[PDB]
Structures are given as C-alpha cells and as structure tokens.
Amino acid sequence: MNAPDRFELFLLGEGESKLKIDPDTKAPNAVVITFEKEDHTLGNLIRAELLNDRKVLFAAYKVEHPFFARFKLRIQTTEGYDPKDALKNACNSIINKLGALKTNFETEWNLQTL
Amino acid sequence: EEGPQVKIREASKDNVDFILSNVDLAMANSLRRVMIAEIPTLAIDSVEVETNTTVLADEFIAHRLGLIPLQSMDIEQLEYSRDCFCEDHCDKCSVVLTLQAFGESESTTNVYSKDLVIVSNLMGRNIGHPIIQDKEGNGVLICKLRKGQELKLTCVAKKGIAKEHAKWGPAAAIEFEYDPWNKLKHTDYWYEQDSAKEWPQSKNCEYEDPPNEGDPFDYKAQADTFYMNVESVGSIPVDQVVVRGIDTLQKKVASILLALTQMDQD
Amino acid sequence: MIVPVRCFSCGKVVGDKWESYLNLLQEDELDEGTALSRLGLKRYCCRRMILTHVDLIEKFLRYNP
Amino acid sequence: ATLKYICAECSSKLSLSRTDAVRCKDCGHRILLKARTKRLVQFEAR
Amino acid sequence: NQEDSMIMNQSSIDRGLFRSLFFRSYMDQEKKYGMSITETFEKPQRTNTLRMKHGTYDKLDDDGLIAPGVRVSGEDVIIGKTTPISSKRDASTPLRSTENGIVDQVLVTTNQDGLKFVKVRVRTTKIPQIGDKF
Ligand SMILES: [Zn+2]
Ligand SMILES: [Zn+2]
Ligand SMILES: [Zn+2]
Numbered sequence: 001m002n003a004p005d006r007f008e009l010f011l012l013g014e015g016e017s018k019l020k021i022d023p024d025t026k027a028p029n030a031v032v033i034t035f036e037k038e039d040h041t042l043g044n045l046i047r048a049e050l051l052n053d054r055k056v057l058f059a060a061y062k063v064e065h066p067f068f069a070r071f072k073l074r075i076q077t078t079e080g081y082d083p084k085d086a087l088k089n090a091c092n093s094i095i096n097k098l099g100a101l102k103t104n105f106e107t108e109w110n111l112q113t114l
Numbered sequence: 115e116e117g118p119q120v121k122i123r124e125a126s127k128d129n130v131d132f133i134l135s136n137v138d139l140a141m142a143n144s145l146r147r148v149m150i151a152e153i154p155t156l157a158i159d160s161v162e163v164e165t166n167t168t169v170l171a172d173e174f175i176a177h178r179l180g181l182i183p184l185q186s187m188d189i190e191q192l193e194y195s196r197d198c199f200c201e202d203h204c205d206k207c208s209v210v211l212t213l214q215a216f217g218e219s220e221s222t223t224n225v226y227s228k229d230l231v232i233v234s235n236l237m238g239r240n241i242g243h244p245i246i247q248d249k250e251g252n253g254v255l256i257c258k259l260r261k262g263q264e265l266k267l268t269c270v271a272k273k274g275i276a277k278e279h280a281k282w283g284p285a286a287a288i289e290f291e292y293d294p295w296n297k298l299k300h301t302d303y304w305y306e307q308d309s310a311k312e313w314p315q316s317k318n319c320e321y322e323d324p325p326n327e328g329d330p331f332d333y334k335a336q337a338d339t340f341y342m343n344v345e346s347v348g349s350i351p352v353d354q355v356v357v358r359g360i361d362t363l364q365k366k367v368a369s370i371l372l373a374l375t376q377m378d379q380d
Numbered sequence: 381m382i383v384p385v386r387c388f389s390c391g392k393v394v395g396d397k398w399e400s401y402l403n404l405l406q407e408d409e410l411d412e413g414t415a416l417s418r419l420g421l422k423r424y425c426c427r428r429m430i431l432t433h434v435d436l437i438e439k440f441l442r443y444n445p
Numbered sequence: 446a447t448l449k450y451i452c453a454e455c456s457s458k459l460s461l462s463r464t465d466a467v468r469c470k471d472c473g474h475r476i477l478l479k480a481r482t483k484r485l486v487q488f489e490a491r
Numbered sequence: 492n493q494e495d496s497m498i499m500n501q502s503s504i505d506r507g508l509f510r511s512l513f514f515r516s517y518m519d520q521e522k523k524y525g526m527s528i529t530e531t532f533e534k535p536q537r538t539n540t541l542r543m544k545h546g547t548y549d550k551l552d553d554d555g556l557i558a559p560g561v562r563v564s565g566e567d568v569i570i571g572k573t574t575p576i577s578s579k580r581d582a583s584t585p586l587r588s589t590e591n592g593i594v595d596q597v598l599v600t601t602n603q604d605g606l607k608f609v610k611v612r613v614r615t616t617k618i619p620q621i622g623d624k625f
C-alpha cells in the first residue's frame with residue numbers, strides 16, 4: 001500500500017539524470033557523483049577500479065538508504081587530473097576487462113562439447 | 115588470452131562450472147549480481163480470466179502463470195511495452211498465449227506449461243514458447259480439474275528483469291567461491307577443538323595448493339581465481355546467462371560514460 | 381495447495397518435478413532422499429520445496445462442482 | 446441460454462426474476478449462487 | 492533485523508513465500524416491517540428523499556448484488572437494498588472502507604422466515620510486506 005513501484009528501481013523519473021556531479025568542499029580536487037536508479041552492482045565495481053588508478057587519492061561509495069536505488073561516489077585525485085577523467089578511464093577499463101572476459105568465455109564454450 | 119581468463123570445468127544445458135581468473139573480486143561479484151538481477155527474459159505479466167471453475171483462486175493461478183519459463187533466446191528482438199509506441203501492447207512488444215482447459219475425463223484432468231498456445235505473431239523470433247524440460251514433455255503443472263471444472267484465460271507475456279519481479283530470473287542459484295584454503299584470512303573459522311577437522315574441505319581445495327605451516331602469512335595476496343557455477347532456469351541457455359551477464363554489465367558501465375558525455379555538452 | 385512452480389529461495393523450477401517425484405516413490409519404491417536427488421533437487425532449499433509439500437488440491441477436487 | 450444463478454447441490458443454471466421463489470427447478474434446493482460477470486477480469490501475474 | 496524485526500527475501504516473496512488468501516463475508520436480509528411492508532434487494536436511484544450511500548452503485552446488478560467476477564474497492568456498494576417509509580430510503584451495504592479485493596462468491600437463499608437472505612464473500616491476496624508479523 002505504501003509500497004513504491006518496482007520499476008522505480010531502474011527507470012529514471014521526471015527530470016532525473018543518471019549522474020549528478022557536485023564538487024566536494026571539504027577537500028581539494030574532490031567530487032561527489034550521485035548515481036540514480038543504480039545499486040551496489042555498479043558502485044562497488046567502479047569504486048574498485050578507481051582504486052587501481054595511481055593518480056586517484058580517494059574513492060568510496062555509499063547507498064545511503066536501501067529504500068532508494070541511488071548511490072554517492074566520492075572521487076579525489078592528484079593535481080591536474082579531473083576526477084571526471086578518473087571515472088571516464090575507470091569505466092573504459094571495466095568495459096575492456098569485460099570484453100576480454102566475453103571473448104574468452106565464448107572461446108572456452110566453443111571448445112566444450114555439451 | 116587477453117586480460118581476465120576463464121577455464122570451463124563442466125558444461126550441460128542447465129549448468130556451467132568454470133574458473134574465472136585474473137579478475138578482481140568486485141568484477142566477479144558484479145557479474146554474479148547481473149546474472150540473477152538484470153538479464154531480461156520474457157514472462158507472462160497480464161492474465162485476463164474468461165472463465166474459472168477451478169478449486170484454485172483467479173490470482174493464485176495468475177501468479178503461477180508468471181513463474182512459468184518462456185523462451186527468451188531472441189528477447190532482444192522484443193521491445194519493452196514501456197517504450198513501445200502502441201496503446202498497451204503489440205506484436206513488437208508482447209507474446210499473447212491462450213490457455214483453455216476443461217475436465218472431460220471422469221478422472222482428474224491436468225493443466226500444464228505445454229497447454230499454453232501462442233496466439234500472437236512471433237515475427238519469426240524464438241520467444242514465448244513455454245520451456246519444457248521434463249521426460250514426459252508436459253512442463254509445469256499449472257493446476258488440476260474435476261468434471262465441470264473449466265479454465266479459460268488469456269496471457270500477455272512481456273520483456274522484463276528480476277529487479278521488477280523475480281519471475282524474469284533467467285538463472286537459479288549461482289555457485290560462487292574463492293580461496294578454499296583460507297590463505298587470505300578473509301574468514302575466521304569458528305571451532306571447538308580443531309578448525310581444520312571441524313570445517314569441511316572445498317571441492318576447489320584440489321584446484322589450489324595448500325599453504326604449509328612453515329610459510330608465513332602473505333599480506334601482499336589478493337583474491338583473483340573464483341570457482342563458479344551458473345544454473346539456468348531454461349529461458350536462456352546457460353552460456354548466454356554468462357555472456358548476456360557480461361554484456362548487460364558492460365552496457366551498464368557504458369551508459370555511465372555516455373551520461374558523462376551528455377553532461378559535458380552544457 | 382498444488383506444487384509450487386519454482387523454489388522460493390533459488391528459483392529452480394520444481395513445477396514439473398511433482399508427478400515424477402511421486403512415481404519414483406510409488407512405482408520405483410525409492411526413498412525420498414534418493415528420489416529428490418534423482419530428479420536433481422540438489423540444494424536443501426529445493427529439497428524442502430518438494431519433500432515438505434502438501435498437495436491439498438487433491439482434497440479440494442473431491443468436492444462436487 | 447441466459448445465465449443469472451447456479452444451484453449449489455445439483456449445480457443447474459436457474460436464471461430467476463425478483464419474486465419468483467428462491468428455490469432450484471430440479472431438486473427444490475433453497476441455496477443458490479450468483480453467476481460470475483461476463484466482464485473479463487485482468488490480473489498482474491505477480 | 493534489530494530488536495525482534497527480520498529481513499525477508501524479496502525474490503522469495505515474489506516466488507510465493509508466505510503469500511496468503513483473505514476472505515470476508517458480508518450479509519443482509521429483506522426485513523418484513525409489519526405486514527406486506529418488506530425491504531427490497533435492488534440497485535437504488537435518486538428518488539424523492541432516499542438517504543443513498545456515497546459509494547459506487549454501478550457495480551450492482553438489478554438484483555442489488557455484485558457479480559462474482561468483479562473487482563471491488565473502497566466504499567463500493569456490494570449489496571443494494573431499500574426500506575419504505577410513510578418514497579424509499581437507502582439500506583445498502585458498502586465494502587469496508589479500509590479494504591479492497593475481488594467479489595468471490597455470492598449466495599442467494601431464504602432465511603427460515605421465508606424472506607430473502609444474502610451472503611457476499613470478497614477475496615483478496617495479501618503478499619508479505621514491511622510491517623507484517625511472523
Ligand atoms: Zn507494442
Ligand atoms: Zn532452491
Ligand atoms: Zn438444484
């Protein structure tokens with residue numbers, strides 16, 4: 001009865017953008033991205049890849065309350081590196097890692113006889 | 115060959131046992147998630163009941179119709195009614211199946227997954243066929259009837275994901291394990307006398323070398339190498355639960371880059 | 381009431397496996413332990429699904445209309 | 446064929462008017478059930 | 492799941508865990524006030540000064556009863572009845588405000604006296620939610 005619609009979990013609302021990039025005031029070269037209609041699936045994965053970047057000084061994420069599929073991802077980088085670029089790269093890196101996994105699972109399945 | 119590798123242990127129509135290596139745990143886990151949660155399938159979503167003389171409630175039956183597996187091989191050829199252009203549904207965005215059963219027999223009369231009839235035009239794509247896996251070729255037993263007991267209903271099967279209803283779940287349980295010899299000290303075994311004797315060995319204990327007492331604790335160590343087993347319900351073949359899993363997660367990450375680009379227009 | 385389509389916990393289809401479970405018990409004279417396993421109901425979540433099911437529909441059917 | 450009421454015992458279709466005796470024409474049973482709409486009810490399969 | 496609360500598997504709830512049926516039966520009688528003067532089961536209408544209910548009367552058939560298939564809600568009139576005074580006055584039964592469902596079984600009989608007797612049952616399925624006890 002007070003239950004929200006199930007598709008509200010993944011479909012953006014009226015004037016909802018996937019990303020909201022707001023700058024962090026507390027620290028220099030730091031940003032806070034609010035991912036809407038997303039969960040741990042995407043959060044933890046991006047956060048983790050960001051940690052592989054030497055130029056990335058801080059990366060963390062949080063689903064502030066479970067009732068809402070959205071998370072905040074805070075990225076801090078070394079001077080002259082836009083945290084936006086840090087995320088851009090982290091993503092490309094993930095896609096390329098997955099593509100490799102697809103073409104290799106495909107490889108192995110096409111080797112199996114069942 | 116390139117980047118994170120896979121080594122398939124066993125394969126069937128319903129299960130893939132494999133070893134995912136050179137991956138980060140987060141990636142292995144996200145793929146795990148996606149496989150349950152976000153791979154689209156076709157499932158009955160609307161049930162219009164014409165006549166029902168069954169011992170079973172209209173909605174009890176309606177709910178079972180949802181959970182029945184339907185062919186979702188060419189589920190990409192189908193549109194989400196949500197974003198289709200028709201008033202309610204059409205052939206581009208839905209599969210219409212009719213179910214009509216009557217107790218002709220003096221004995222009990224059964225209603226099955228096989229008794230569903232596709233009335234919509236499939237546009238030549240593999241979709242909406244109820245998945246039959248049993249020996250007898252009957253599929254799921256929808257319900258049982260007496261004599262005058264009749265059941266006439268119409269179904270609208272639509273594209274969907276498990277985040278909306280677990281009926282659009284293309285996969286059953288996904289087996290997931292790493293570090294069988296707890297070399298990473300990621301767990302602290304509860305015991306009474308001996309943690310080793312008390313805690314059963316993994317199957318994957320074979321596929322990894324024990325640590326040996328003399329050797330000190332490796333703090334440098336990181337979790338790569340994940341023993342997994344994906345089990346399909348039948349809607350999509352097991353290989354495609356893994357592949358579509360990889361793709362769905364890819365498209366998801368991709369959407370963020372694209373979103374990041376539209377942002378850098380203004 | 382009637383054999384649930386799929387396991388609550390993992391979603392493995394147990395909808396087909398009823399009549400076949402009952403024949404393994406009756407005709408094959410198998411025990412429940414081996415019967416469930418022959419049908420390939422591996423995890424206990426799936427086992428409890430069939431093993432513990434009460435098919436009341438059979439009683440309800442016994443009433444007239 | 447016109448469909449208003451069903452018998453509970455014999456289950457014979459009865460179709461009756463206001464002030465026409467609330468009994469069944471076969472077995473004189475005084476327990477009757479209303480039809481079911483010709484309207485098609487729809488349900489979300491969840 | 493702190494202080495006697497628990498987490499439940501949403502996936503399992505969908506697959507049908509702890510989901511239940513719920514039925515409620517509403518009842519009425521054509522009372523015989525004095526001699527010849529009797530209450531009438533009928534779908535009423537705005538005639539002279541009858542104190543009619545706010546709910547939808549349009550779900551009723553001419554017998555002053557809902558058909559078993561129909562889906563009811565809020566204060567929808569499930570039993571239509573009139574009482575005469577000396578034109579008519581309303582005595583119709585509306586579905587419980589705080590409730591909704593689908594008309595299940597409608598029973599039309601006679602009470603021992605020989606007067607029209609009616610029982611309307613409404614079925615609702617109740618799926619486990621966040622405040623539900625176990
Ligand atoms: Zn359409
Ligand atoms: Zn299970
Ligand atoms: Zn009769």
